[PDB]
Write a protein that binds this ligand. Structure first.
Ligand SMILES: Cc1cn([C@H]2C[C@@H](OP(=O)(O)O)[C@H](COP(=O)(O)O)O2)c(=O)[nH]c1=O
Ligand SMILES: [Ca+2]
Length: 129
């Protein structure tokens, strides 16, 4: 697994972000993550979290896993890093996402993100409160 560069076009919600990738606008869905919808409990906190993290980054990198790169809606499937920090993980860590949509072949960071989740779940952060 390697990082590829991209530039923010637009924050969307807690687990989607519109990015410029290899010259094309592409909506990315975050691997292994499920944030609440913007109108559920902690949805706006999730959107705000991802938004701030992508908006402040000097460098946004896209990292595909070893499986499918595009979902059935045409969304890129990737781990996204904001100045070297993984948005996917930080959401788990902050208690603003649950680990979800784990398909074998696209799961390199499962343990890591479940670790973050475990610690968020320990502290009773946000959705675990
Ligand atoms: C995260 C992820 C989502 N998806 C698809 C499955 C969709 O299920 P449905 O067929 O039930 O819509 C899901 C919805 O994600 P959202 O959480 O963005 O709504 O997006 C994948 O196919 N692979 C993935 O890795
Ligand atoms: Ca969601």
């Amino acid at each position: 697994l390697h990082k590829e560069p991209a530039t923010l076009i637009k924050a969307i919600d807690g687990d989607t972000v519109k990015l410029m990738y290899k010259g094309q606008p592409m909506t990315f869905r975050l691997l292994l993550v499920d944030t609440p919808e913007f109108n559920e409990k902690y949805g706006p906190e999730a959107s705000a979290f991802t938004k701030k993290m992508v908006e402040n980054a000097k460098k946004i990198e896209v990292e595909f896993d070893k499986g499918q790169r595009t979902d059935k809606y045409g969304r890129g499937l990737a781990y996204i890093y904001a100045d070297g920090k993984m948005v996917n993980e930080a959401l788990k860590r902050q208690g603003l996402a649950k680990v979800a949509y784990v398909y074998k072949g696209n799961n390199t960071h499962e343990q890591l993100l479940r670790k973050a989740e475990a610690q968020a779940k320990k502290e009773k952060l946000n959705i675990w409160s």
